[PDB]
Write an enzyme that holds these catalytic residues in place. Structure first.
Site, PDB file in Angstrom:
ATOM      1  N   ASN A  93     -82.447  67.253  35.492  1.00 45.03           N
ATOM      2  CA  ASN A  93     -82.007  68.521  35.357  1.00 45.03           C
ATOM      3  C   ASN A  93     -82.611  69.648  35.722  1.00 45.03           C
ATOM      4  OD1 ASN A  93     -80.775  70.861  34.077  1.00 45.03           O
ATOM      5  ND2 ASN A  93     -80.618  70.010  31.826  1.00 45.03           N
ATOM      6  N   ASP A 192     -78.645  70.914  38.425  1.00 45.84           N
ATOM      7  CA  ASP A 192     -78.421  70.014  37.350  1.00 45.84           C
ATOM      8  C   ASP A 192     -77.455  68.755  37.704  1.00 45.84           C
ATOM      9  OD1 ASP A 192     -78.593  68.133  35.365  1.00 45.84           O
ATOM     10  OD2 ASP A 192     -77.560  69.738  33.969  1.00 45.84           O
ATOM     11  N   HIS A 348     -68.284  70.242  39.516  1.00 47.74           N
ATOM     12  CA  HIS A 348     -69.271  69.514  40.441  1.00 47.74           C
ATOM     13  C   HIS A 348     -68.508  68.634  41.408  1.00 47.74           C
ATOM     14  CE1 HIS A 348     -73.715  70.738  40.117  1.00 47.74           C
ATOM     15  NE2 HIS A 348     -73.247  70.867  38.709  1.00 47.74           N
ATOM     16  N   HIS A 382     -72.984  74.192  41.818  1.00 47.44           N
ATOM     17  CA  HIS A 382     -73.278  75.557  41.953  1.00 47.44           C
ATOM     18  C   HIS A 382     -73.745  75.614  43.558  1.00 47.44           C
ATOM     19  CE1 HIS A 382     -73.807  76.177  37.592  1.00 47.44           C
ATOM     20  NE2 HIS A 382     -74.297  74.808  37.603  1.00 47.44           N
ATOM     21  N   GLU A 407     -80.509  77.439  43.591  1.00 50.53           N
ATOM     22  CA  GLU A 407     -80.789  77.018  42.392  1.00 50.53           C
ATOM     23  C   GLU A 407     -82.413  76.831  42.358  1.00 50.53           C
ATOM     24  OE1 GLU A 407     -78.609  75.094  39.445  1.00 50.53           O
ATOM     25  OE2 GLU A 407     -80.426  74.822  38.054  1.00 50.53           O
ATOM     26  N   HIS A 409     -84.147  76.334  39.270  1.00 48.53           N
ATOM     27  CA  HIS A 409     -84.502  76.411  37.877  1.00 48.53           C
ATOM     28  C   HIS A 409     -85.871  75.987  37.352  1.00 48.53           C
ATOM     29  CE1 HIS A 409     -81.696  75.454  33.973  1.00 48.53           C
ATOM     30  NE2 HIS A 409     -82.943  76.263  33.944  1.00 48.53           N
ATOM     31  N   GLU A 452     -79.154  79.826  37.963  1.00 48.79           N
ATOM     32  CA  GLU A 452     -80.452  79.714  37.355  1.00 48.79           C
ATOM     33  C   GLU A 452     -81.732  79.840  38.149  1.00 48.79           C
ATOM     34  OE1 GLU A 452     -78.940  75.782  35.476  1.00 48.79           O
ATOM     35  OE2 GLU A 452     -79.209  76.888  33.598  1.00 48.79           O
ATOM     36  N   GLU A 528     -70.600  79.852  31.774  1.00 50.38           N
ATOM     37  CA  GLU A 528     -70.699  78.282  31.408  1.00 50.38           C
ATOM     38  C   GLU A 528     -70.495  78.764  30.015  1.00 50.38           C
ATOM     39  OE1 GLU A 528     -73.922  77.136  34.727  1.00 50.38           O
ATOM     40  OE2 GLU A 528     -74.165  76.197  32.728  1.00 50.38           O
ATOM     41  N   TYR A 529     -69.880  77.768  29.203  1.00 47.63           N
ATOM     42  CA  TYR A 529     -69.619  77.775  27.727  1.00 47.63           C
ATOM     43  C   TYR A 529     -69.153  76.586  27.255  1.00 47.63           C
ATOM     44  CZ  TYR A 529     -64.583  78.700  27.164  1.00 47.63           C
ATOM     45  OH  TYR A 529     -63.144  78.502  27.509  1.00 47.63           O
ATOM     46  N   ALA A 530     -69.210  76.134  26.087  1.00 48.41           N
ATOM     47  CA  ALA A 530     -68.387  74.876  25.403  1.00 48.41           C
ATOM     48  C   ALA A 530     -68.742  73.602  26.052  1.00 48.41           C
ATOM     49  CB  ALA A 530     -67.052  75.152  25.220  1.00 48.41           C
ATOM     50  N   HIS A 531     -70.041  73.427  26.194  1.00 51.59           N
ATOM     51  CA  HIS A 531     -70.850  72.177  26.798  1.00 51.59           C
ATOM     52  C   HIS A 531     -70.150  70.989  26.334  1.00 51.59           C
ATOM     53  CE1 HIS A 531     -74.350  69.867  28.090  1.00 51.59           C
ATOM     54  NE2 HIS A 531     -74.327  70.617  29.215  1.00 51.59           N
ATOM     55  N   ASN A 588     -86.504  61.350  34.379  1.00 51.85           N
ATOM     56  CA  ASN A 588     -85.019  61.551  34.545  1.00 51.85           C
ATOM     57  C   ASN A 588     -84.483  62.255  33.238  1.00 51.85           C
ATOM     58  OD1 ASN A 588     -83.716  59.542  32.391  1.00 51.85           O
ATOM     59  ND2 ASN A 588     -85.502  58.541  33.414  1.00 51.85           N
ATOM     60  N   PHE A 592     -77.734  63.579  30.189  1.00 53.62           N
ATOM     61  CA  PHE A 592     -77.333  65.100  30.522  1.00 53.62           C
ATOM     62  C   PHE A 592     -76.572  65.440  31.727  1.00 53.62           C
ATOM     63  CE2 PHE A 592     -78.789  67.828  26.898  1.00 53.62           C
ATOM     64  CZ  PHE A 592     -79.581  67.057  26.286  1.00 53.62           C
ATOM     65  N   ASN A 595     -71.352  65.662  31.022  1.00 56.76           N
ATOM     66  CA  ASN A 595     -70.856  66.858  30.342  1.00 56.76           C
ATOM     67  C   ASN A 595     -69.383  67.189  30.669  1.00 56.76           C
ATOM     68  OD1 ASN A 595     -73.482  68.359  31.878  1.00 56.76           O
ATOM     69  ND2 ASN A 595     -73.888  67.243  30.273  1.00 56.76           N
ATOM     70  N   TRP A 990     -78.521  71.411  23.376  1.00 59.75           N
ATOM     71  CA  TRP A 990     -80.132  71.330  23.470  1.00 59.75           C
ATOM     72  C   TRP A 990     -80.637  72.116  22.356  1.00 59.75           C
ATOM     73  CZ3 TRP A 990     -76.790  72.652  27.156  1.00 59.75           C
ATOM     74  CH2 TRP A 990     -76.802  73.977  27.487  1.00 59.75           C
TER      75      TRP A 990
HETATM   76  C1  IPT Z   1     -82.572  73.923  28.558  1.00 61.84           C
HETATM   77  C2  IPT Z   1     -81.850  73.187  29.373  1.00 61.84           C
HETATM   78  C3  IPT Z   1     -80.816  72.357  28.343  1.00 61.84           C
HETATM   79  S1  IPT Z   1     -80.901  74.121  30.454  1.00 61.84           S
HETATM   80  C4  IPT Z   1     -79.058  73.686  30.511  1.00 61.84           C
HETATM   81  O1  IPT Z   1     -78.912  72.223  30.915  1.00 61.84           O
HETATM   82  C5  IPT Z   1     -77.519  71.842  30.714  1.00 61.84           C
HETATM   83  C6  IPT Z   1     -77.346  70.357  30.881  1.00 61.84           C
HETATM   84  O2  IPT Z   1     -76.071  69.830  31.218  1.00 61.84           O
HETATM   85  C7  IPT Z   1     -76.890  72.593  32.037  1.00 61.84           C
HETATM   86  O3  IPT Z   1     -77.435  72.423  33.364  1.00 61.84           O
HETATM   87  C8  IPT Z   1     -77.214  74.101  31.670  1.00 61.84           C
HETATM   88  O4  IPT Z   1     -76.571  74.755  32.754  1.00 61.84           O
HETATM   89  C9  IPT Z   1     -78.425  74.585  31.572  1.00 61.84           C
HETATM   90  O5  IPT Z   1     -78.517  75.647  31.304  1.00 61.84           O
HETATM   91 MG    MG Z   2     -80.262  74.284  36.163  1.00 63.75          MG
HETATM   92 NA    NA Z   3     -75.834  68.459  32.797  1.00 63.75          NA
END
Ligand code: IPT
Ligand code: MG
Ligand code: NA
Ligand code: MG
Ligand code: NA
Ligand code: NA
Ligand code: NA
EC number: 3.2.1.23
Lengths: 1014, 210
Positions: A93, A192, A348, A382, A407, A409, A452, A528-531, A588, A592, A595, A990
């Site tokens: 990620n 990610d 994606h 992205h 990116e 990150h 990011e 991004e919202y509502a994971h 890894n 994650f 999603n 998270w």
């Molecule tokens: C603090 C981390 C969980 S960052 C978090 O991870 C997610 C995992 O799906 C996505 O990649 C989001 O974009 C990212 O902000």
């Molecule tokens: Mg990222």
């Molecule tokens: Na992810």
């Protein structure tokens, strides 16, 4: 070439690469250009190439340049070589998959050697220019033609083009491409997602004449009411300038030509040195243009003809034109003068079989499903997408955020490279070449600077570059706190509706609060919202209530569309869904990568229906017998919509009807329901309305349901006392049991455990595991968060439950008595659940078994106020029977939870047992249905006001098993019946995200069930 | 018809258990053929002299949410002090109880009445786990008010000075009480989370003598 390690130099991002430009095909016939038919001058090299794998480029034999390696295999291109099995895909990620030591990459750098032997006709080399186009190569490559080095390219997600004219010969030619997995470009490609590599998009050859259209930009501007437009087309040429040269831009609506302009080259004066002699700007008047939007994607066709004054065509290019204006005014994002509400999703490019290779079928499948579920927008998370995506979005109607492939990150801090001027050249090309490629697509409404990568000065420079070059689209970017000087739109990720998250330096304010911070004026749209990770989208409705109440809250993009799961095969060659770590890839980030609203194969998760319902374009209100329908379309009337309505008494249809919808955009329609006949019997009358599309569209089928809503009408409470029975149940006592007998029925209560341990109908056991209280759930992804065995996150719900002993609390008996009554037996029980001397839960019950065979269970639970609020309050047991169907009166048909049940309707539902289980790839608590008044399974009926799930999988097996394919159906059926069940959350995955009103904090809980046989 | 609804008895049974008597009742409140409320109760009286009351109420979903879900009676006793373990010392309501503190409070009876010039429901205390008055003790988790004025007199009386102490003491014990509101006083202002809309309600009391 080995000397000069260009893949470890951010100062070298290409060698001999041609200028970027919008899609070309070099038609030599105007009509073919107009109709968008294939072009003889554009050849596809999407066939079988030769491929060989090496651990490092130092291991590539020099002989490979001149001759095919016999060791090599024959593989499909485009492809990712991880999907062919040459090495393993890595899922991480945030943490970079390589050591963080810019500009350097590992000495062990997987190298893919691609080659192809192909024909070129002499006609292509006699005159003009022959170029090769690689739409996607991950992550850097050197190119050779007929033994000779041509060039080099970086950026995995934009086309790299090279002039081969001097390299080719008529007849047999050989291309050799050395693809490097890791490069200095990898430092800017830390999205990610699965880290893969290879020539993963189209390869083509393009023939252009020497005198050529080298670039063209299409702009559309409007008067105040959009009744007049000017199409402005800037056209650039290469080759020798001549007085006889002309450009004609013509505009078409189907087969009707609407406007046309012809001019010679030679632009207006620009500065003291003159103008652009190699450019011309054509301007066409268009009266009452048909406007483009996601609602009605009206397109015109612009044909760009380069020709002589006398009328000989040299070449034509073309593009689809959508007439639309995008602007921010008074803090609102406007399309064609109207404030948008973004019903978006991040998407994606992922295929479970083919990795990151996109195909038309999957692309189309995605768009259809998106529009069918009331999405109107998509974010290219992205990176720039496969070029056909934009064409499809243009044509079906979807708003696009076009995002640069940047990116970083995993840097510390996140802006370490983006604030470094030495990384600006590399960054600049990832932004500039995207804009140059995609700027003519009407579907693109917003540019994004990447993802990011913190906020650095390079962002501010590149922000301003796009603002100079293309004033037609707002520029957004979330990095460094989502409201920096590098963004036109406040675009946070995972900011909550009401709750502030005041992280130092980069707080995520409540979105309602963020809007009104001193001096803040901009619109807010969550990138991004509502994971949607696993069993998620709890609290989704809360976002939409806010989006609708606040003008400047203009929506957002769900994270995300499709699970990034990959197919693996077992010893029997049976397929299964794999995630992080399933390829020996380490470190890894496990599940994650998953999603999505849909599974990798595009089957929906239950959350999709919740998104469809909340993103509906028709809002409803009921007053007496009058339904008020409000349209949230901005441009279209409801000319392919009818309202079906149905009134039912506890699932029993009583009346129905249909009324055409005739609602102007943003308008209202009143529908008066006819007098409904009174029901004799008791129960709740329910009204359900649905919006149906009688006609098929380009994106949906005839009869498609686009919106629905439900109301309680009149309730007649049951006052009739049930028919008195003449039989009276018999109590039999032993040291170990209380047994109750009535006819062919028997109940058994264990006096040592205090639970109903067995039930007989006739002679047959009904239970395999006694009926016991349950306070835990097999943890959801939202409960788990980022915790691990080697690095506990003490804040995660699962860890709080574990540390408090919720999962290992043992029931201790306090009371078990039996009393014989006039027409019943009453069993009274009390239990305590304790962990290390601390009393977690107390459960006090009565069971009343009367002469009619009904068992009434009353349950009253206390929960210690200082223990973490429990996941559920209910009972479970393993039934002996496996029945085919599940019938219930309650919320459905699909899986629904307290904070994700708005989509569900109250009615009588009947499904196969298998649909009552949701095959989440990472298994957890699942398949719950809430607001249930009656449940039927085989001979059993449960009544009350409860939530339930029912399946062949125990909570224990679900929490012990890390993959759905390793699950085995247990004997009988596990039934969990809950009086109360915790929210699922999902604002992110998270940190704890279950809202206070969905936590089971009341201290004292009460529920009652009636168990009987029908 | 909330103020004029009359109880219609559905069920009244008695059972002897090993060390207790159980009374089971069910009532329906009706107005013009329409059933507004159902009350199902058990009363369990044991050898310790404690009476455990379970109350389970159904409220019709198309009837306006009721002001309260509770019990009332006029006690024969007039005592000087009211003692309670709950929120206080002052009058508090579900949407106005943040200032009140959970503790053991002991006040003269007249302090359990608030003399609003225009009389209304008054003097409630919420989150009460134990209430003591004369020879009586009630335990559970409830809201109560206690005074010499019936809800009926309060509602029929326009001025505080016109009120007269009724014989004995009126006790209202609520499992649930609607918010009071106040955002304004000319349109409904009780927020949705403080409206009694749940449809089915449960509360339990133990009445005894200390
Ligand atoms: C603090 C981390 C969980 S960052 C978090 O991870 C997610 C995992 O799906 C996505 O990649 C989001 O974009 C990212 O902000
Ligand atoms: Mg990222
Ligand atoms: Na992810
Ligand atoms: Mg480099
Ligand atoms: Na809005
Ligand atoms: Na699991
Ligand atoms: Na009054």
């Amino acid at each position: 070439v080995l000397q000069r390690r260009d893949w470890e130099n951010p100062g070298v991002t290409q060698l001999n690469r041609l200028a970027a430009h919008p899609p070309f095909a070099s038609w030599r016939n105007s009509e073919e250009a107009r109709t968008d038919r294939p072009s003889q001058q554009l050849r596809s090299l999407n066939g079988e190439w030769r491929f060989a794998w090496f651990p490092a480029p130092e291991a590539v034999p020099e002989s490979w340049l001149e001759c095919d390696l016999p060791e090599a295999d024959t593989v499909v291109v485009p492809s990712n070589w991880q999907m062919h099995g040459y090495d393993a895909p890595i899922y991480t990620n945030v943490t970079y998959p390589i050591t963080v030591n810019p500009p350097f990459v590992p000495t062990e750098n997987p190298t893919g050697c691609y080659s192809l032997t192909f024909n070129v006709d002499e006609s292509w080399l006699q005159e003009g220019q022959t170029r090769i186009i690689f739409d996607g190569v991950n992550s850097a490559f050197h190119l050779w033609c007929n033994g000779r080095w041509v060039g080099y390219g970086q950026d995995s997600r934009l086309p790299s083009e090279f002039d081969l004219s001097a390299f080719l010969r008529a007849g047999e030619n050989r291309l050799a491409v050395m693809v490097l997995r890791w490069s200095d470009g990898s430092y800017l490609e830390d999205q990610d997602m699965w880290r893969m590599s290879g020539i993963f998009r189209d390869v083509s050859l393009l023939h252009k004449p020497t005198t050529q259209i080298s670039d063209f930009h299409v702009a559309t501007r409007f008067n105040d009411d959009f009744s007049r437009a000017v199409l402005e087309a800037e056209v650039q040429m290469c080759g020798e300038l001549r007085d006889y040269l002309r450009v004609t831009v013509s505009l078409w609506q189907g087969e009707t030509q609407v406007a046309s302009g012809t001019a010679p080259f030679g632009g207006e004066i620009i500065d003291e040195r003159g103008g652009y002699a190699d450019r011309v700007t054509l301007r066409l008047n268009v009266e009452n243009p048909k406007l483009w939007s996601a609602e009605i994607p009206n397109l015109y066709r612009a044909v760009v003809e380069l020709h002589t004054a006398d009328g000989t065509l040299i070449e034509a290019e073309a593009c689809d034109v959508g007439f639309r204006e995008v602007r921010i005014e008074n803090g609102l994002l406007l399309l064609n003068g109207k404030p948008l509400l973004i019903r978006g999703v991040n998407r994606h490019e992922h295929h479970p079989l083919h990795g990151q290779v996109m195909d038309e079928q999957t692309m189309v499948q995605d768009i259809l499903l998106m529009k069918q579920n009331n999405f109107n927008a998509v974010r290219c998370s992205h990176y720039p997408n496969h070029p056909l995506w934009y064409t499809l979005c243009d044509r079906y109607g979807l708003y696009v955020v076009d995002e640069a492939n940047i990116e970083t990150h995993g840097m510390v801090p996140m802006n370490r490279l983006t604030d470094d001027p030495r990384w600006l050249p590399a960054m600049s090309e990832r932004v500039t070449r995207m804009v140059q490629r995609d700027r003519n697509h009407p579907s693109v409404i917003i540019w994004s600077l990447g993802n990011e990568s913190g906020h650095g000065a390079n962002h501010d420079a590149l922000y301003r570059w796009i603002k100079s070059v293309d004033p037609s689209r707002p520029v957004q970017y979330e990095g460094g706190g989502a409201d920096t000087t590098a963004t036109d739109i406040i675009c946070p990720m995972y900011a909550r509706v009401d709750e502030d998250q005041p992280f130092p330096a980069v707080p995520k304010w409540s979105i309602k609060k963020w809007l009104s911070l001193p001096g803040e004026t901009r619109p807010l749209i969550l990138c991004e919202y509502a994971h949607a990770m696993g069993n998620s989208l709890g609290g989704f409705a809360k976002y939409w209530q806010a989006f609708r109440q606040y003008p400047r809250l203009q929506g957002g993009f769900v994270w995300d569309w499709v699970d990034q799961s990959l197919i693996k095969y077992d010893e029997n060659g049976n397929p299964w869904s794999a995630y992080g770590g399933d390829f020996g890839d380490t470190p890894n980030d496990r599940q994650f990568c998953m999603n999505g609203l849909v599974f990798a194969d595009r089957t929906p998760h239950p959350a999709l229906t919740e998104a469809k319902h909340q993103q509906q374009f028709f809002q409803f209100r009921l007053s007496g017998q009058t339904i008020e329908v409000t349209s949230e379309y901005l441009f279209r009337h409801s000319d392919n919509e009818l309202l079906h309505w149905m009134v039912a008494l506890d699932g029993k249809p009583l009346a129905s009807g249909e009324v055409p919808l005739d609602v102007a955009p943003q308008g209202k329609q009143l529908i008066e329901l006819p007098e409904l006949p009174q029901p004799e019997s008791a129960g709740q009358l329910w009204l359900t309305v649905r919006v149906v599309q009688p006609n098929a569209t380009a994106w949906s089928e005839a009869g498609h349901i686009s919106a629905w809503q439900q109301w309680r009408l009149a309730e007649n409470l049951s006052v009739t006392l049930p028919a008195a029975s003449h039989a009276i149940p018999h109590l039999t006592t032993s040291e170990m049991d209380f047994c109750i007998e009535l006819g062919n029925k028997r109940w058994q209560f264990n006096r040592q455990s205090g639970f109903l341990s067995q039930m007989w109908i006739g002679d047959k056991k009904q239970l395999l595991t006694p009926l016991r209280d349950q306070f835990t759930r097999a943890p959801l992804d939202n409960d788990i968060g980022v915790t691990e065995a080697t690095r506990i996150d003490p804040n995660a719900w699962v860890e709080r439950w574990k540390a408090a002993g919720h999962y290992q609390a043992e029931a201790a008996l306090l009371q078990c008595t039996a009393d014989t009554l006039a027409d019943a037996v009453l069993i009274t029980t009390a239990h305590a659940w304790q962990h290390q001397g601390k009393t977690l839960f107390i459960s006090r019950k009565t069971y009343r078994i009367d002469g009619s065979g009904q068992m009434a269970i009353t349950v009253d639970v206390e929960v210690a106020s200082d223990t973490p609020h429990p996941a559920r309050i209910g009972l479970n047991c393993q039934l002996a029977q496996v029945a085919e169907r599940v019938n219930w009166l309650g919320l459905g048909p699909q899986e629904n939870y307290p904070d994700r049940l708005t989509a569900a309707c109250f009615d009588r539902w009947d499904l196969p047992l298998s649909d009552m289980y949701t095959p989440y790839v990472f298994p957890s608590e699942n398949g719950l249905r809430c607001g249930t008044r009656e449940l039927n399974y085989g001979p059993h009926q449960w009544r009350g006001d409860f939530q339930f799930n029912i399946s062949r999988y125990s909570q224990q097996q679900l929490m012990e098993t890390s993959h759905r394919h390793l699950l085995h159906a247990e004997e009988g059926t596990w039934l969990n019946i809950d009086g109360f069940h915790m929210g699922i959350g999902g604002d992110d995955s998270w940190s704890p995200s279950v809202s206070a009103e969905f936590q089971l904090s009341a201290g004292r809980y009460h529920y009652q069930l009636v168990w009987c046989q029908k």
